Design a protein around this ligand. Sequence first.
Ligand SMILES: [K+]
Ligand SMILES: [Mg+2]
Ligand SMILES: [Mg+2]
Ligand SMILES: [Mg+2]
Ligand SMILES: [Mg+2]
Ligand SMILES: [Mg+2]
Ligand SMILES: [Mg+2]
Ligand SMILES: [Mg+2]
Ligand SMILES: [Mg+2]
Ligand SMILES: [Mg+2]
Ligand SMILES: [Mg+2]
Ligand SMILES: [Mg+2]
Ligand SMILES: [Mg+2]
Ligand SMILES: [Mg+2]
Ligand SMILES: [Mg+2]
Ligand SMILES: [Mg+2]
Ligand SMILES: [Mg+2]
Ligand SMILES: [Mg+2]
Ligand SMILES: [Mg+2]
Ligand SMILES: [Mg+2]
Ligand SMILES: [Mg+2]
Ligand SMILES: [Mg+2]
Ligand SMILES: [Mg+2]
Ligand SMILES: [Mg+2]
Ligand SMILES: [Mg+2]
Ligand SMILES: [Mg+2]
Ligand SMILES: [Mg+2]
Ligand SMILES: [Mg+2]
Ligand SMILES: [Mg+2]
Ligand SMILES: [Mg+2]
Ligand SMILES: [Mg+2]
Ligand SMILES: [Mg+2]
Ligand SMILES: [Mg+2]
Ligand SMILES: [Mg+2]
Ligand SMILES: [Mg+2]
Ligand SMILES: [Mg+2]
Ligand SMILES: [Mg+2]
Ligand SMILES: [Mg+2]
Ligand SMILES: [Mg+2]
Ligand SMILES: [Mg+2]
Ligand SMILES: [Mg+2]
Ligand SMILES: [Mg+2]
Ligand SMILES: [Mg+2]
Ligand SMILES: [Mg+2]
Ligand SMILES: [Mg+2]
Ligand SMILES: [Mg+2]
Ligand SMILES: [Mg+2]
Ligand SMILES: [Mg+2]
Ligand SMILES: [Mg+2]
Ligand SMILES: [Mg+2]
Ligand SMILES: [Mg+2]
Ligand SMILES: [Mg+2]
Ligand SMILES: [Mg+2]
Ligand SMILES: [Mg+2]
Ligand SMILES: [Mg+2]
Ligand SMILES: [Mg+2]
Ligand SMILES: [Mg+2]
Ligand SMILES: [Mg+2]
Ligand SMILES: [Mg+2]
Ligand SMILES: [Mg+2]
Ligand SMILES: [Mg+2]
Ligand SMILES: [Mg+2]
Ligand SMILES: [Mg+2]
Ligand SMILES: [Mg+2]
Ligand SMILES: [Mg+2]
Ligand SMILES: [Mg+2]
Ligand SMILES: [Mg+2]
Ligand SMILES: [Mg+2]
Ligand SMILES: [Mg+2]
Ligand SMILES: [Mg+2]
Ligand SMILES: [Mg+2]
Ligand SMILES: [Mg+2]
Ligand SMILES: [Mg+2]
Ligand SMILES: [Mg+2]
Ligand SMILES: [Mg+2]
Ligand SMILES: [Mg+2]
Ligand SMILES: [Mg+2]
Ligand SMILES: [Mg+2]
Ligand SMILES: [Mg+2]
Ligand SMILES: [Mg+2]
Lengths: 154, 386
Amino acid sequence: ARYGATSTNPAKSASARGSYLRVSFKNTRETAQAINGWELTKAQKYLEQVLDHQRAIPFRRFNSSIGRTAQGKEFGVTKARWPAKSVKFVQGLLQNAAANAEAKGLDATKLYVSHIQVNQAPKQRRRTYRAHGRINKYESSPSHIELVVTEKEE
Amino acid sequence: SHRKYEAPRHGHLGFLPRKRAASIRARVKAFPKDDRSKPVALTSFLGYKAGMTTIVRDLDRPGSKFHKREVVEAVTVVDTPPVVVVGVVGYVETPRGLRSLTTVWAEHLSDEVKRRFYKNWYKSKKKAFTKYSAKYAQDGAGIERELARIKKYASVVRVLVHTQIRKTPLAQKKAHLAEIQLNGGSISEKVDWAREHFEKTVAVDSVFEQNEMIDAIAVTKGHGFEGVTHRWGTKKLPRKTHRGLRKVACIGAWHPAHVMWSVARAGQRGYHSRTSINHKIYRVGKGDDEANGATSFDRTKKTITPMGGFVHYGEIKNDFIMVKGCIPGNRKRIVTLRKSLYTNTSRKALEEVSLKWIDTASKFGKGRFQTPAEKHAFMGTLKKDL
RNA sequence: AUAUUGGCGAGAGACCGAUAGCGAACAAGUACAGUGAUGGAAAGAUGAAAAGAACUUUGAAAAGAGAGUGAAAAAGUACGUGAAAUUGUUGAAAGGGAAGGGCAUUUGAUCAGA
RNA sequence: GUCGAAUUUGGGUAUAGGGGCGAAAGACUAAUCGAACCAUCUAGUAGCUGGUUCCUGCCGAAGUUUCCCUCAGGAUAGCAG
RNA sequence: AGAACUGGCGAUGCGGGAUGAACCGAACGUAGAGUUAAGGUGCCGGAAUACACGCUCAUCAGACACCACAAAAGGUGUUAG
RNA sequence: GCCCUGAAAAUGGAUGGCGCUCAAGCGUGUUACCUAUACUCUACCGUCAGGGUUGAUAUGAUGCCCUGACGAGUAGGCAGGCGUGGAGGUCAGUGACGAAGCCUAGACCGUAAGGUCGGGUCGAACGGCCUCUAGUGCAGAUCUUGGUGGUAGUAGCAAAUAUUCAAAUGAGAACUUUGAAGACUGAAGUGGGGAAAGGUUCCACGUCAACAGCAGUUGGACGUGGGUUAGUCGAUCCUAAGA
RNA sequence: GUGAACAGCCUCUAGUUGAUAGAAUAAUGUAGAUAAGGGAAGUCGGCAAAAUAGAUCCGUAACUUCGGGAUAAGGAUUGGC
RNA sequence: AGAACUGGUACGGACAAGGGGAAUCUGACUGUCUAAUUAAAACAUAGCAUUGCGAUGGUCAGAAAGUGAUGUUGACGCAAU
RNA sequence: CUAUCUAGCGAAACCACAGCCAAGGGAACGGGCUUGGCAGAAUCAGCGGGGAAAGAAGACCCUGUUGAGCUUGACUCUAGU
RNA sequence: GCGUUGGAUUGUUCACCCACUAAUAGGGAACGUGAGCUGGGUUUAGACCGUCGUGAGACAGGUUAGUUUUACCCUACUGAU
RNA sequence: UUGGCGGAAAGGCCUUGGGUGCUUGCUGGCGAAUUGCAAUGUCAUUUUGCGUGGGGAUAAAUCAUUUGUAUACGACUUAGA
Ligand SMILES: [K+]
Ligand SMILES: [Mg+2]
Ligand SMILES: [Mg+2]
Ligand SMILES: [Mg+2]
Ligand SMILES: [Mg+2]
Ligand SMILES: [Mg+2]
Ligand SMILES: [Mg+2]
Ligand SMILES: [Mg+2]
Ligand SMILES: [Mg+2]
Ligand SMILES: [Mg+2]
Ligand SMILES: [Mg+2]
Ligand SMILES: [Mg+2]
Ligand SMILES: [Mg+2]
Ligand SMILES: [Mg+2]
Ligand SMILES: [Mg+2]
Ligand SMILES: [Mg+2]
Ligand SMILES: [Mg+2]
Ligand SMILES: [Mg+2]
Ligand SMILES: [Mg+2]
Ligand SMILES: [Mg+2]
Ligand SMILES: [Mg+2]
Ligand SMILES: [Mg+2]
Ligand SMILES: [Mg+2]
Ligand SMILES: [Mg+2]
Ligand SMILES: [Mg+2]
Ligand SMILES: [Mg+2]
Ligand SMILES: [Mg+2]
Ligand SMILES: [Mg+2]
Ligand SMILES: [Mg+2]
Ligand SMILES: [Mg+2]
Ligand SMILES: [Mg+2]
Ligand SMILES: [Mg+2]
Ligand SMILES: [Mg+2]
Ligand SMILES: [Mg+2]
Ligand SMILES: [Mg+2]
Ligand SMILES: [Mg+2]
Ligand SMILES: [Mg+2]
Ligand SMILES: [Mg+2]
Ligand SMILES: [Mg+2]
Ligand SMILES: [Mg+2]
Ligand SMILES: [Mg+2]
Ligand SMILES: [Mg+2]
Ligand SMILES: [Mg+2]
Ligand SMILES: [Mg+2]
Ligand SMILES: [Mg+2]
Ligand SMILES: [Mg+2]
Ligand SMILES: [Mg+2]
Ligand SMILES: [Mg+2]
Ligand SMILES: [Mg+2]
Ligand SMILES: [Mg+2]
Ligand SMILES: [Mg+2]
Ligand SMILES: [Mg+2]
Ligand SMILES: [Mg+2]
Ligand SMILES: [Mg+2]
Ligand SMILES: [Mg+2]
Ligand SMILES: [Mg+2]
Ligand SMILES: [Mg+2]
Ligand SMILES: [Mg+2]
Ligand SMILES: [Mg+2]
Ligand SMILES: [Mg+2]
Ligand SMILES: [Mg+2]
Ligand SMILES: [Mg+2]
Ligand SMILES: [Mg+2]
Ligand SMILES: [Mg+2]
Ligand SMILES: [Mg+2]
Ligand SMILES: [Mg+2]
Ligand SMILES: [Mg+2]
Ligand SMILES: [Mg+2]
Ligand SMILES: [Mg+2]
Ligand SMILES: [Mg+2]
Ligand SMILES: [Mg+2]
Ligand SMILES: [Mg+2]
Ligand SMILES: [Mg+2]
Ligand SMILES: [Mg+2]
Ligand SMILES: [Mg+2]
Ligand SMILES: [Mg+2]
Ligand SMILES: [Mg+2]
Ligand SMILES: [Mg+2]
Ligand SMILES: [Mg+2]
Ligand SMILES: [Mg+2]
């Protein structure tokens, strides 16, 4: 419990989270922002399309010197990617949240991703060996991912 | 300190930036000066570069070592089917430049030019000009009103013509639309010429004549990213050079503490708009006319197409303009041929050429035969046939 | 009678309070490095009590969501509190080759006094 | 370059720091050599470089004299509290 | 580069000299009002496109000291002796 | 006198710029006007000085009050205060009904050091005042230790010819197993054994959190076990340089 | 097997198929190459590259310490049956 | 070793595999060194020459020794250049 | 084969704040200051003008009443003889 | 505005000559330009010589050998969204 | 409402006719207060959403696949009911 700041009704909302997930925090943040606020089924279809390379995740913050694609046109960007690992983790959490919403008795047809936040988990540290007998860090940047899906209301 | 050895600058600073042209069809940035006593006529034409071939002609140049002698010359064949007039544009002159006032289109447009207005034609509903075609509903009062506006104003009149690539062997299927300035008198009767030519074709034999010096406006062949050695022709650095030798060694002095715009740097090469002038028309041959490649000295019943077709283009079946030498752009590319902007009288212009022989051997290799008949006569009988 | 930074047994302190105090509050002269002489760390705190989360559900699983224990799970062992750098989400605001600042007022937000 | 002898190499053994060893380069002596490494004397000394942690109030300089193995320092008088 | 006297800068902000350690004015608690200094008043820019007598036309005009340079020699240019 | 020639330097550029021609230029004169932390007056702060007032309800005579002048400041000196750890005294001080700590573009007091309050979090001690004491105040020292960024999803993961198809297993297979194919080492081997060294890595079973700079169901990994059988092979014995 | 050959190249027994991959084929690299005519004009300097190359036969100079130089230089031939 | 025939005159057909000559400076040669910027003309070398010494000795060790290296040696030797 | 694009993985140097110019003045070569020119999000591949770019308390030079290696009838000693 | 060259010798700047040419002008840009190169010279450490010094050693005297590191950041520029 | 003119950015100007309101050209009748002695004392136009009626219209682009006249990636150029 104790998710990030949410402004929705907890009685019409269902949560999912995953901690210390060994997936790139930056890619996961971009993937999360890609579906932030979307309808649940639309976001899931979009993530499957991303895995199929039919649509892309627009990289908005962590995108220096990545590369350009035409599949960022629909998001008004030139820099988009297909972070399969991040997408798979986000689908796992989306499916978990959908299961929790089904258990709680929320309408799956009205579910949208009302909150999704990715922050940095503690780094897992390895070592890389550099010229002249040097040693540098080879750390992972894992992610805490959380999301809550809420029934849309009026 | 000074250069210690003078050399001319590498490259031309007036052809900057060496960027990709904004379109595949080069813009005619100037039309011939309007002489308002001549009949109304198109000042340029649209065609497609088919390829190059070879011709033989007797050189008529008194005082030359090759006077009254035979010269072999390279020529470019530009496939030029007639262009359809589909509209008229009026231009009023303003203290801020020329300005389009209004454009009057033809009532019926072919699918060729309608394709120009669609990125995805196959899945569109083809609604283009469907409400405009109602302007000709009963007598075309609204259309004649727009034409009257062009006559009351619009010191410059241009017609909208489009190619017919269905007549070329090109796979594009989407025509090229361009404005051609109408030279000739009485701006009012410029509009009259345009209106009576709506939905009508204008052939290149009514625009260009034999021996005329014309300008070819085309986008050059693209070559992508290029290094300074070939993009600008700078000297190759010695073989001993670390970090590479296809570079410019010093790209600037310490001051100004900036790279100057005039320093050769690696970037896009080709795909530039170029206007090359003074290309002499050697043939205005007609597509319906068999023996296009025949001359008064050759007389072989042969088309201008080389054996096996123009390489990467196909066969010529329309009117074609054969210009001396080479013109910008590669095969299959749209080119605009415009009349020369000045009166050239140099004995290089004003020369009347009569072709003696046109090379129609295969360009797909070391062509040996001008026609398939010659191949059969030389080879005799083969196992497959002949 | 005098000495005593070792040993044994005691009593204390205007001393230090886990980057301090011995190197060592802890399986510390340990782990580890060096051929060797030698060098030599880091590392304390759930809770009164494990009562350390039965059971259900989603997931291949890790886990999640519940349920529950507990005074508190804003104490879940990655455990007292939980700063800053740095970061995510949300909200607000501004943004023509920096940003930040001073004086004064407009505007928006917010607020004490009477 | 050399490649059948002033050859190349394993292991054993000997030589230890102002010492060894050197077909000699101040070369090598455990990534250390114009004097190895380790611990201690040792918190070595430094007229030299860097830093030196709260506020406000009042007063407020000197680069000049003489001497100094003195000239990037000090003593002395002056200026200041 | 070295001395004499003074005033400064250093150690000092403020107004002016666009800018600037030293020049000019003026030295400073926090505010208000008035008047000024040096410097300015076409616009940037607060303040007369003020008044008055003249001079100058420059195909490199000239436009306030420190200070950001210009000379000898020349011109029926023009003005006054 | 003014103007002109004399009068040539390098990125494009400077009466500050625009621009200015009976000037907005030059010489000169007369006024009006503008504005410094300067001058005049007033208020307030502090400092210094000269004074009044112990006769009372008068507990603050370093108190209260009157008057005048003054205020720049490095190095530096002095003074009055703020804050911290611990100490004696005192408030029979605060507190599990919530101490300390921490967060708080919320409020108040002080010129300031700082102090006080409200809200949230939190869980066991802490403060005001008189005085004592010091391991007592950080922005720097290529400061010490720890932690964290931008760089940056970036450089990069390119030597040793080379992989491919299907099936099985599995949640998941480019990488595991088997089959099929294509190759290579090409006997001075990428084969088969040993010496030094390592020490269990050998082998089986289970197994994938970490490691194998991709992956992993695989492993020299992780967990649990099994395994090294001598009169003849060595050591042991001999002596060598030497100790 | 070829070959003078433990060279290089290919293969049998045995072993491995292990080096992060997929897609494109810009510049500039790294490694490997080719190039008309000229032939060191390049450059400090033929650096780098090229040319020559095995074997058999012929032929071999100056100089010489009489041993060499020497594979001097310069030529010719080479397959299959 | 030779002959005939044969072919797009190819033929050490891949692989493998000297460029050569005329000279000058320098070190005779083979060999050796600055591991990690110097491979050399530097060091060494054989040859030559000089020096000390007949052992109660020369040269050189050790703090000292009833201690050592040369020396299991003897001038055709050892030691120092 | 890279680079480049992608999936996965994923550093470092460096970093006062940062990043458009001309001139001026200025510690006499400004990204910031003054006066001008100008100036429109977010970016990708290249590139080597600038950041007086990074790497290292300049190794040259001077100073220090700081050394060390070596030399010699320096000064002062000393093993040995 | 436009051009101002090919070479022999020399690290050279400079110079000098041959030759062509319209001409073979002079200069600046951190004596432009080394994360552009090269490294011939100078200017570490090796070595040789001549002069000098008793010597260690000295020499704008000569000679030979002698590691040329990093951009992926910002800007500038070249292209591209 | 009738006709005409204006294309430099026209987007406005002129004009015919009737209808209708006002007319301070002149003369009357009624009303105003208390906004308390002032307080812009709210009278303009600029965009946006929304609701009520009326009128009018009945597409494309991008991704994905494809082309190579293009190309590092984007981008460009093509094709596909
Ligand atoms: K030394
Ligand atoms: Mg970038
Ligand atoms: Mg890159
Ligand atoms: Mg490495
Ligand atoms: Mg190593
Ligand atoms: Mg020149
Ligand atoms: Mg060309
Ligand atoms: Mg090189
Ligand atoms: Mg051809
Ligand atoms: Mg703790
Ligand atoms: Mg609690
Ligand atoms: Mg905690
Ligand atoms: Mg923070
Ligand atoms: Mg910008
Ligand atoms: Mg030496
Ligand atoms: Mg060593
Ligand atoms: Mg000390
Ligand atoms: Mg010390
Ligand atoms: Mg004072
Ligand atoms: Mg000093
Ligand atoms: Mg000073
Ligand atoms: Mg002053
Ligand atoms: Mg000035
Ligand atoms: Mg005042
Ligand atoms: Mg004004
Ligand atoms: Mg004069
Ligand atoms: Mg003025
Ligand atoms: Mg005047
Ligand atoms: Mg007093
Ligand atoms: Mg003061
Ligand atoms: Mg203490
Ligand atoms: Mg509390
Ligand atoms: Mg407690
Ligand atoms: Mg202290
Ligand atoms: Mg600090
Ligand atoms: Mg400080
Ligand atoms: Mg630091
Ligand atoms: Mg640190
Ligand atoms: Mg990369
Ligand atoms: Mg690599
Ligand atoms: Mg490989
Ligand atoms: Mg297999
Ligand atoms: Mg091989
Ligand atoms: Mg093989
Ligand atoms: Mg095993
Ligand atoms: Mg891995
Ligand atoms: Mg894994
Ligand atoms: Mg095991
Ligand atoms: Mg035996
Ligand atoms: Mg044989
Ligand atoms: Mg050639
Ligand atoms: Mg040739
Ligand atoms: Mg030749
Ligand atoms: Mg030459
Ligand atoms: Mg040359
Ligand atoms: Mg030369
Ligand atoms: Mg070579
Ligand atoms: Mg020979
Ligand atoms: Mg010879
Ligand atoms: Mg030799
Ligand atoms: Mg070496
Ligand atoms: Mg070497
Ligand atoms: Mg010698
Ligand atoms: Mg500048
Ligand atoms: Mg200057
Ligand atoms: Mg700077
Ligand atoms: Mg400015
Ligand atoms: Mg680069
Ligand atoms: Mg640079
Ligand atoms: Mg220094
Ligand atoms: Mg130093
Ligand atoms: Mg001294
Ligand atoms: Mg000494
Ligand atoms: Mg220079
Ligand atoms: Mg440079
Ligand atoms: Mg360099
Ligand atoms: Mg240079
Ligand atoms: Mg050199
Ligand atoms: Mg040397
Ligand atoms: Mg001598």
